[PDB]
Amino acid sequence: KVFGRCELAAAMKRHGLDNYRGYSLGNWVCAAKFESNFNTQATNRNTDGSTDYGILQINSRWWCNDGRTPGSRNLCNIPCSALLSSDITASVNCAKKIVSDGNGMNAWVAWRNRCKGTDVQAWIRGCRL
Ligand SMILES: [Pt+4]
Ligand SMILES: [Pt+4]
Ligand SMILES: [Pt+4]
Question: Catalytic residue numbers?
Fold first, then answer.
């Protein structure tokens, strides 16, 4: 499913991401825009053989099992395919584990490079939440 900006903001807010570990909603919506262009079905292969999955491009080296990343850790305890669903619950619950890991939202390279220190509130501007 390809989310609208405000539709996704509302879903993330309902799932408890607004201010989770101090990150306002706009940060999460910005990360999703640049990671996956709001498409829950996005996949991208990494040079090391791992793959990133879904709206927040969560990586199979650490976070999920895809049956093809030898030595992967499955920290969210979930098949990676679960992260591609139109229901963002699995992605959101896994993202909460990731952002609590010690590096905050720096775990998402597009967030570091494209959202961090920008006016992220613009991403929720005009939305009914
Ligand atoms: Pt939902
Ligand atoms: Pt594996
Ligand atoms: Pt709402």
Answer: 35, 52
